[PDB]
Amino acid sequence: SGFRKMAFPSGKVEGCMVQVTCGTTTLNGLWLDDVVYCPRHVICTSEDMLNPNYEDLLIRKSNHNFLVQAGNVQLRVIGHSMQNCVLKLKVDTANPKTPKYKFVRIQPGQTFSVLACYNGSPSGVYQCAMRPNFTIKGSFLNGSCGSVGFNIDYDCVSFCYMHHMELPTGVHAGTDLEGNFYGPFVDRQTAQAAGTDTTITVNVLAWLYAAVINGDRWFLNRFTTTLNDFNLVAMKYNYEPLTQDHVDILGPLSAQTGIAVLDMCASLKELLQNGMNGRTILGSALLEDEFTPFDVVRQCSGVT
Amino acid sequence: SGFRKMAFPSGKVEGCMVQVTCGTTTLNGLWLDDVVYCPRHVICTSEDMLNPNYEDLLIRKSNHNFLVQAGNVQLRVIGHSMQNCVLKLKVDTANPKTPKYKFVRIQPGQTFSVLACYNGSPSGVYQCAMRPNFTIKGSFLNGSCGSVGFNIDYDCVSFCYMHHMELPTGVHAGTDLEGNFYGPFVDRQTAQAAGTDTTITVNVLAWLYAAVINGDRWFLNRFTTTLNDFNLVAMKYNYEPLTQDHVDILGPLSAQTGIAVLDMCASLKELLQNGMNGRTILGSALLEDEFTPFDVVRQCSGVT
Ligand SMILES: *CC(=O)NC1=NC(SC)=C(C#N)C2(CCCCC2)[C@@H]1C#N
Ligand SMILES: *CC(=O)NC1=NC(SC)=C(C#N)C2(CCCCC2)[C@@H]1C#N
């Protein structure tokens, strides 16, 4: 029993972290096979970030201008290319610590672990979600760009995120491992405002099921509702609309607890309309939306 | 910017996790050098746990009765000994993945990361604190016993906890790496009730400083207080008494923010007396007490 915001074990990603320096700018890189992936703005100075033309700045860079350090050993760069907002540095040595991996572009509401890094060295690991406005509420200081987000399925690491930017509001923006930003963000130091950070309804429901499984059941009420009625309430409280796909995804949690998805929806509806009344659910005084239904299943069943 | 419940990168501990089987009971072990550490109740059946005499049960066990599996390879057990509530299995092979390590017995209020494991395989990593009643609010399912808690300083892993038990209330109890339980707990399936789970005052203050550093400053008020006045309020709200040692430990946070420790104490006092009034601090609707002052410094400064 007990329910925690759990991140995946980070060792498989720790063994891929390198330092990438180009001129005076240094950031984190990800060494997978004989390639190093890093934000393309490793070729920029702080002044360049105001209005960078990456194609023009990259013309003035050769393989030897990129320094890649793995721990303390220097990897020889034998090729370089820009792919969207990431640079791919072909090195002469395959990473001996390359785990089984895939690059995945996740959907909003999906969760992943971030291995926060500075100078190619790992400092911490935390769990977070791709917000519905395509930002992440990370914890990143200067020097963390290039840190990646990932999920682990048995022995396979699915890299889903690379840290590139911090918006003026303190939220973070980045790309998948193909260099495409999540959301409408750009790698430029210009005012980029995020849209409404709505709550991930299916995740709140999933966490409400985990609460029931762990004995926190005070919030369970005597009512039910329909998807349309629930959605009218969810729209009022800036919650994402719930779909039949989300109901199907909640199926195993509904089966395990004996609580119909729409019955939990009605419980959530009353919580939105009345508040927690000074009470907690799983040690939280607010409704948690950064546990997907699969995260709850994994944590409540013990998937290694 | 951004503040997250961050755990240490777990790779150095992942490479030490083994499976220990004795008869039909299997739990997690920690392989450091040529020794494997695990809960002594690996020699017990579920019936034995009702009233075990470990010394008597251990007489009927030889080196060959303990099976140790590292990933999938079988380590040869060449010695065994009981040290308090842990068994030490001397194996014929030194762990090639042994990081730099120390065994430390932590004080209540201290935080550490837990690498939750099942069958010697890691499933997740989370951050938690040794509560003032010597329990931990972990997340452990059947098969997780033997999972360890640790802190990392540069390249050195300080192991501080080993999971041994779940109390009837859902909280967890365990030992340091010398087999001594934190608190008055015993490795017996008998009713053990925990004492008052009080709030770690110095950690709440430390998290209030992290909030100020990250821009959440609504709670800062126009008052100050004394240690004695603050402590009268802290006693009323089941908060630990704050000492001059705790004030000294908060010194760097006080220096960085320009907020005197007793001024933050007065802010905390008003928060205890009025509540949050529906507001959040660092995305939390309650006061967080599982970040030590050192954790805040590390996260807000970028220690790898
Ligand atoms: C996202 C990020 O922080 N980018 C960085 N840009 C630049 S100039 C394009 C930097 C420089 N020099 C640093 C790397 C060194 C520390 C200061 C920021 C980063 C990073 N990370
Ligand atoms: C702390 C804990 O869970 N202990 C266990 N005891 C016993 S009997 C002494 C077990 C058995 N058999 C298991 C290990 C296998 C899964 C069921 C529980 C554990 C554990 N862990």
Side-chain angles (χ1 to χ4, degrees):
Chain A
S1 74
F3 209 70
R4 280 278 178 174
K5 186 71 69 65
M6 201 176 286
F8 287 102
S10 68
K12 282 170 196 288
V13 178
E14 283 169 54
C16 308
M17 300 307 302
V18 300
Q19 202 190 60
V20 185
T21 300
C22 181
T24 62
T25 300
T26 293
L27 41 65
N28 306 284
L30 186 67
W31 184 23
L32 288 172
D33 301 323
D34 62 350
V35 182
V36 176
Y37 302 74
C38 76
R40 67 181 177 168
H41 73 256
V42 73
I43 66 180
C44 306
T45 66
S46 306
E47 178 168 30
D48 285 331
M49 287 312 285
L50 301 186
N51 196 1
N53 185 293
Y54 290 96
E55 205 71 60
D56 292 346
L57 287 163
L58 196 50
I59 292 176
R60 313 250 148 270
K61 309 289 188 177
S62 296
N63 297 327
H64 71 261
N65 296 121
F66 300 94
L67 304 171
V68 186
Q69 212 169 321
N72 276 338
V73 298
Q74 208 68 23
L75 317 185
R76 180 175 304 277
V77 180
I78 66 177
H80 70 274
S81 63
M82 185 163 61
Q83 175 178 25
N84 307 304
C85 305
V86 308
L87 300 177
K88 293 193 296 177
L89 305 177
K90 198 207 181 187
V91 290
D92 74 354
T93 305
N95 181 8
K97 298 182 195 164
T98 309
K100 308 208 162 171
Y101 74 96
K102 289 170 167 225
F103 286 175
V104 302
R105 180 170 184 87
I106 62 163
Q107 293 308 302
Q110 283 195 81
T111 59
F112 56 90
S113 307
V114 168
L115 180 67
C117 283
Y118 298 93
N119 297 110
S121 276
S123 57
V125 63
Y126 57 83
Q127 187 76 355
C128 71
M130 176 58 55
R131 301 312 308 173
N133 65 2
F134 291 102
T135 67
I136 82 166
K137 298 195 176 92
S139 178
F140 294 110
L141 298 179
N142 302 135
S144 64
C145 297
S147 299
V148 300
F150 61 97
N151 284 271
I152 298 169
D153 187 1
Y154 170 41
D155 55 358
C156 181
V157 180
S158 284
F159 292 101
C160 62
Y161 181 81
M162 176 168 284
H163 186 50
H164 287 243
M165 199 172 58
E166 175 176 74
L167 299 181
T169 53
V171 301
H172 307 101
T175 74
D176 53 26
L177 264 295
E178 293 190 327
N180 291 124
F181 265 93
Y182 284 98
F185 306 116
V186 296
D187 48 4
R188 285 174 232 153
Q189 196 186 315
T190 185
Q192 300 178 70
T196 310
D197 192 353
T198 51
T199 307
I200 314 147
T201 307
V202 63
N203 288 8
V204 169
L205 287 173
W207 169 88
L208 283 179
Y209 278 105
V212 166
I213 298 172
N214 289 283
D216 264 38
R217 322 149 56 92
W218 65 263
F219 59 87
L220 294 179
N221 55 42
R222 307 180 156 276
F223 336 119
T224 196
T225 183
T226 64
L227 254 185
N228 289 163
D229 177 58
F230 176 76
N231 287 327
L232 287 173
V233 185
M235 184 151 61
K236 173 160 158 44
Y237 290 90
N238 296 124
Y239 262 58
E240 289 284 294
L242 194 80
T243 64
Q244 185 60 45
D245 276 357
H246 293 138
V247 175
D248 301 341
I249 286 159
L250 292 165
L253 293 177
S254 181
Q256 182 177 355
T257 64
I259 302 166
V261 166
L262 297 176
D263 290 6
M264 194 63 92
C265 287
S267 283
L268 178 51
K269 166 173 151 192
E270 300 294 306
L271 282 177
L272 294 173
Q273 294 172 347
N274 317 325
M276 326 264 296
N277 273 114
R279 302 190 276 273
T280 62
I281 297 177
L282 289 180
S284 184
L286 52 87
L287 307 171
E288 300 294 307
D289 77 342
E290 295 196 349
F291 293 99
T292 65
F294 290 76
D295 287 346
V296 171
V297 164
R298 191 168 309 112
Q299 190 167 170
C300 296
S301 85
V303 180
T304 57
Chain B
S1 74
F3 209 70
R4 280 278 178 174
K5 186 71 69 65
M6 201 176 286
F8 287 102
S10 68
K12 282 170 196 288
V13 178
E14 283 169 54
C16 308
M17 300 307 302
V18 300
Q19 202 190 60
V20 185
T21 300
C22 181
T24 62
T25 300
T26 293
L27 41 65
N28 306 284
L30 186 67
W31 184 23
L32 288 172
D33 301 323
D34 62 350
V35 182
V36 176
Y37 302 74
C38 76
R40 67 181 177 168
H41 73 256
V42 73
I43 66 180
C44 306
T45 66
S46 306
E47 178 168 30
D48 285 331
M49 287 312 285
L50 301 186
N51 196 1
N53 185 293
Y54 290 96
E55 205 71 60
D56 292 346
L57 287 163
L58 196 50
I59 292 176
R60 313 250 148 270
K61 309 289 188 177
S62 296
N63 297 327
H64 71 261
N65 296 121
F66 300 94
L67 304 171
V68 186
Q69 212 169 321
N72 276 338
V73 298
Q74 208 68 23
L75 317 185
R76 180 175 304 277
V77 180
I78 66 177
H80 70 274
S81 63
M82 185 163 61
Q83 175 178 25
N84 307 304
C85 305
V86 308
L87 300 177
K88 293 193 296 177
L89 305 177
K90 198 207 181 187
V91 290
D92 74 354
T93 305
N95 181 8
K97 298 182 195 164
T98 309
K100 308 208 162 171
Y101 74 96
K102 289 170 167 225
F103 286 175
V104 302
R105 180 170 184 87
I106 62 163
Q107 293 308 302
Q110 283 195 81
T111 59
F112 56 90
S113 307
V114 168
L115 180 67
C117 283
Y118 298 93
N119 297 110
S121 276
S123 57
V125 63
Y126 57 83
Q127 187 76 355
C128 71
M130 176 58 55
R131 301 312 308 173
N133 65 2
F134 291 102
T135 67
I136 82 166
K137 298 195 176 92
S139 178
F140 294 110
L141 298 179
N142 302 135
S144 64
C145 297
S147 299
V148 300
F150 61 97
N151 284 271
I152 298 169
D153 187 1
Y154 170 41
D155 55 358
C156 181
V157 180
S158 284
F159 292 101
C160 62
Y161 181 81
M162 176 168 284
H163 186 50
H164 287 243
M165 199 172 58
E166 175 176 74
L167 299 181
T169 53
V171 301
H172 307 101
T175 74
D176 53 26
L177 264 295
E178 293 190 327
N180 291 124
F181 265 93
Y182 284 98
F185 306 116
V186 296
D187 48 4
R188 285 174 232 153
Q189 196 186 315
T190 185
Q192 300 178 70
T196 310
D197 192 353
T198 51
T199 307
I200 314 147
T201 307
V202 63
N203 288 8
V204 169
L205 287 173
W207 169 88
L208 283 179
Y209 278 105
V212 166
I213 298 172
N214 289 283
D216 264 38
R217 322 149 56 92
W218 65 263
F219 59 87
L220 294 179
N221 55 42
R222 307 180 156 276
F223 336 119
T224 196
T225 183
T226 64
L227 254 185
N228 289 163
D229 177 58
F230 176 76
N231 287 327
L232 287 173
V233 185
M235 184 151 61
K236 173 160 158 44
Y237 290 90
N238 296 124
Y239 262 58
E240 289 284 294
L242 194 80
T243 64
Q244 185 60 45
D245 276 357
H246 293 138
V247 175
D248 301 341
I249 286 159
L250 292 165
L253 293 177
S254 181
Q256 182 177 355
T257 64
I259 302 166
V261 166
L262 297 176
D263 290 6
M264 194 63 92
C265 287
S267 283
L268 178 51
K269 166 173 151 192
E270 300 294 306
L271 282 177
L272 294 173
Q273 294 172 347
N274 317 325
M276 326 264 296
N277 273 114
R279 302 190 276 273
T280 62
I281 297 177
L282 289 180
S284 184
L286 52 87
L287 307 171
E288 300 294 307
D289 77 342
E290 295 196 349
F291 293 99
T292 65
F294 290 76
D295 287 346
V296 171
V297 164
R298 191 168 309 112
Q299 190 167 170
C300 296
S301 85
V303 180
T304 57

